[PDB]
Amino acid sequence: GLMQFTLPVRLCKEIELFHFDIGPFENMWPGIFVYMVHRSCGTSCFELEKLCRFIMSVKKNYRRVPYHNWKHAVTVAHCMYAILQNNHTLFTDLERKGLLIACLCHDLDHRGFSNSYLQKFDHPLAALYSTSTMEQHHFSQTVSILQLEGHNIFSTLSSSEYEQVLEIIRKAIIATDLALYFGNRKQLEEMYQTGSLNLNNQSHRDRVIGLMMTACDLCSVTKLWPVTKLTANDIYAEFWAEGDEMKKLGIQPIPMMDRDKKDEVPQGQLGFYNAVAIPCYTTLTQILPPTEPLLKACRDNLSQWEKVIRGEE
Ligand SMILES: CN(C[C@H](O)CO)C(=O)c1nn(C)cc1NC(=O)c1nc(C2CC2)ccc1Nc1cncnc1
Ligand SMILES: [Mg+2]
Ligand SMILES: [Zn+2]
């Protein structure tokens, strides 16, 4: 109750900002998350003994992969923290509880392979779950860890509030399947443009939480250039290994995953910023004006990739 978390002065200040990097000290990330839960949620939201045991079991069940790792889990939770603190009054106590947890768990037990590589490999998870394969697996892993003893961080919720929050978490995790983002954004865009968007319509809230989840998931493209550039290497290390594994199956991968096609990466980031990132953060800023800084940072990084092509770096 009276045990607050504090950070150093630089972190205490820079953590409120969207472009905050959680830094290379693994053992500080758990406190960074508790700090964000206590301020976003309150110091009463979670039994600290249970939250801390929950946080360490989630850490335990991320894998040592170049990108979809424990650092990603906390990075995506920090972006969701920033959005919640910039839209203080728009969200319920349960949504703020749920979403930060949704973020920390969204990629549990990720192996570094897309849903497509699971399908072509004929992985058992693709037989159990035909669409959003990894994402249904991530939500499965989250429920499992919540059911471990001393780990039920929601224990003080009523049967119905418990089922609301798991529903919020289930939909939030499923939304991180990018293949679902395109439609979700196009429907948010139209609803905004025809003035029919309504945050009292639960179906509408669901969609808007959807877009937040994509925005937090992609938030490595909203960092300062040196962080974005260095994280791009981690994401491509996974893509190249998946492409290698595609060749192992007898399938020539798309270029973005062909490690023999590095020369095409700057031009591929252009497409990616144009087709995915800028639209995502444009529609978010339209629905949530205080998230403008993510669009700005995303635009700066696009501008930086054009400079790479022009051989100015
Ligand atoms: C074009 N589509 C989407 C397809 O239509 C469907 O998958 C792409 O996914 C795509 N195409 N290219 C050439 C790159 C792509 N993705 C990425 O670079 C990329 N992806 C993801 C998640 C959603 C997978 C997170 C970050 C990404 N980059 C990045 C840049 N800097 C720092 N950190 C990360
Ligand atoms: Mg994912
Ligand atoms: Zn993710």
Swiss-Prot record:
Family: Belongs to the cyclic nucleotide phosphodiesterase family.
Name of the gene: PDE10A
Name of this chain's protein: cAMP and cAMP-inhibited cGMP 3',5'-cyclic phosphodiesterase 10A
Summary of the tissues where the protein is detected: Abundant in the putamen and caudate nucleus regions of brain and testis, moderately expressed in the thyroid gland, pituitary gland, thalamus and cerebellum.
Binding-site list for a divalent metal cation 1: H72, H106, D107, D217
Function: Plays a role in signal transduction by regulating the intracellular concentration of cyclic nucleotides. Can hydrolyze both cAMP and cGMP, but has higher affinity for cAMP and is more efficient with cAMP as substrate. May play a critical role in regulating cAMP and cGMP levels in the striatum, a region of the brain that contributes to the control of movement and cognition.
Origin organism lineage: Eukaryota, Metazoa, Chordata, Craniata, Vertebrata
Subunit structure: Homodimer.
Residues that hold 3',5'-cyclic AMP according to the record: H68, Q269
Catalytic residues (UniProt): H68
Domain notes: The tandem GAF domains bind cAMP, and regulate enzyme activity. The binding of cAMP stimulates enzyme activity. Composed of a C-terminal catalytic domain containing two divalent metal sites and an N-terminal regulatory domain which contains one cyclic nucleotide-binding region.
Subcellular location as annotated: Cytoplasm, Cytosol
Domain of life: Eukaryota
Residue numbers binding a divalent metal cation 2: D107
